[PDB]
Design a binder for this molecule. Structure first.
Ligand code: LU8
Ligand code: LU8
Ligand code: LU8
Ligand code: LU8
Lengths: 292, 283
């Protein structure tokens, strides 16, 4: 029973479209890629070929298809469906308590450590576009990481399955200093893990703002909302991150709450300009497991 | 909208180290479904990446329909779906069938047309493509008498090839691997062997040769790399041209053509475009 019914469009952008569909009587998400993003479709298909990729905190794969008649081609990715939508969507109007905030951020750390660590199998994987729109919320209050179209793979028993020649990929708002200044070591797998850690810190900040403490919470804002234009360019981001050495501000009310004090310390250890100074995903996961 | 993806697998028409090929049915229409072995997974990726780069459409190239990857409990299933050619492969067809002048030329000109289309860069278009496993089992026969080239799982854009069809520069490891033209010239060598296989089955003066694969008389049934190197590189043997061909003007011209695909020096061999021109002036 391979047939799918497309029921409603839940997203449209430069990436193509995502549809809620029905398959074997279950909701599925069907992404139809833009022509512009055909290399992402193939990269994501290469990533999902890994059976040991499967994890509670990684978006689960059902099928990938490239179809053509005559001169046009369609590119399909079919996954499990998360009706709560992205973490970006969820944070807009929901506030969090301590338990819900830690559950979300530990689940993302668990997914990211699963990607980064080689299994002897699954290669080590760096995501390269981590952000709150690429994280889905599950009904159990954990998240899963989505969109492996820019991912890079590495095997310690051999070598490295790397990028296109274009290093200006990833979402500009979440790009690490070394991506924005184009000094990143492109032949070094560890470089790409360190870019993910930078972006994880920004996602931690986005989530923590929405956790209530002492009857106070911040409104949802994207990273660097206060220092860059609404739709920031690559150069806008380079200016604030590389020239101005800006990092997201820690609201002072956080320092009255032990959880938010711990999270502020963790996100600062994701934001060093020196990529090798940043925490590992495993260390973040260990730290969040210990925080109450 | 409904996306009908069900494909009914009706009969297995091929089994091998590569996996299986099935005749299937989608929406009342025959398709061919290649189900890849774990052994041959990289061929699915290479062909899929090529068709994602350039959607080839040519009467003498097997017609792409889809690349499918389906998650199973503990495995990934990889299918390539193409048009279906009920007459099967040229290899199959030549075992039983003899040819006349018109059929022989139509077959070999259609293969040369497919191969030149792969080899040529078209601007505005397609990258140049070398096949790297051209042989009579990777050519399908169509009802209109033309053939189409199949299996781009080893193709390169600008697993090893079948040993029996490897050019001398592949067997002696002197191939200039950093030069794309090298891979075109390896295909031309293999094309010459296919042209020999076909020409043997063309009747002249009531005479025809039995189907044999290239080098049948000088290598074992399943030849080693070394077996082939000794024949092709050390002794510099080439397939036999029977005397009876020299009584027939078509087979005389085809013998000259196949000799010009088999030079030891890869840069001396004819190009696919020159082979096409030569064939349009025979008969
Ligand atoms: C994969 O293969 C097959 C696919 C199909 C098929 C089924 N539904 C719809 C389509 C289609 C419609 C419209 C557009 C275009 C039209 C112009 N512009 C607006 C862009 C969009 C593209 C595609 C097709 C091609 C049929 C087939 O056979 C009859 C196929 O072959 C097996
Ligand atoms: C990020 O990337 C991918 C995501 C998905 C995916 C999976 N489940 C659910 C969704 C979703 C559903 C619904 C909403 C709501 C939110 C707000 N409301 C106002 C409108 C709609 C948002 C999101 C998505 C987008 C599938 C993908 O591929 C098939 C993705 O690409 C890899
Ligand atoms: C996913 O998988 C398979 C799909 C199909 C298939 C079945 N029905 C319809 C289609 C179709 C084509 C094109 C469009 C649209 C695209 C955008 N719009 C502006 C124009 C037209 C819609 C739908 C397809 C591609 C067949 C399959 O097997 C033969 C598939 O499995 C490999
Ligand atoms: C070389 O490679 C590929 C080939 C094909 C393919 C396409 N049409 C038809 C065929 C076929 C059909 C029927 C017979 C036999 C069965 C009955 N009788 C005893 C004589 C005839 C043989 C062959 C094939 C094998 C598809 C592929 O992929 C989907 C191939 O791989 C790219």
């Amino acid at each position: 029973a391979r047939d799918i019914t497309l029921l409603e469009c839940v997203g449209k952008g430069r990436y193509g479209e995502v549809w809620r569909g029905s398959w074997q009587g279950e909701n599925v998400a069907v992404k139809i890629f833009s022509s512009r993003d055909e290399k992402s479709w193939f990269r994501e298909t290469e990533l999902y070929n890994t059976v040991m990729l499967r994890h509670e905190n990684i978006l689960g794969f059902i099928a990938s298809d490239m179809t053509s008649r005559h001169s046009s081609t369609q590119l399909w990715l079919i996954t499990h469906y998360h009706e709560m939508g992205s973490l970006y969507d969820y944070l807009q109007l929901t506030t969090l308590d301590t338990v819900s905030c830690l559950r979300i951020v530990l689940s993302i750390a668990s997914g990211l450590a699963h990607l980064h660590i080689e299994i002897f199998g699954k290669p080590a994987i760096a995501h390269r576009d981590l952000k709150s729109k690429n994280i889905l919320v599950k009904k159990n209050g954990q998240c899963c990481i989505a969109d492996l179209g820019l991912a890079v793979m590495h095997s310690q028993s051999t070598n490295q399955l790397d990028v296109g020649n274009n290093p200006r990929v990833g979402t500009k708002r979440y790009m690490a200093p070394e991506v924005l200044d184009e000094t990143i070591q492109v032949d070094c797998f560890d470089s790409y893990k360190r870019v993910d850690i930078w972006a994880f810190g920004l996602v931690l900040w986005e989530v923590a703002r929405r956790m209530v403490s002492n009857g106070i919470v911040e409104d949802y804002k994207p990273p660097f909302y206060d220092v860059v234009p609404n739709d920031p360019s690559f150069e806008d981001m380079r200016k604030v991150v590389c020239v101005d050495q800006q990092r997201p501000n820690i609201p002072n009310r956080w320092f009255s709450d032990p959880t938010l004090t711990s999270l502020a310390k963790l996100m600062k250890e994701c934001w060093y300009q020196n990529p090798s100074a940043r925490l590992t995903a495993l260390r973040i996961k260990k730290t969040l497991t210990k925080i109450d």
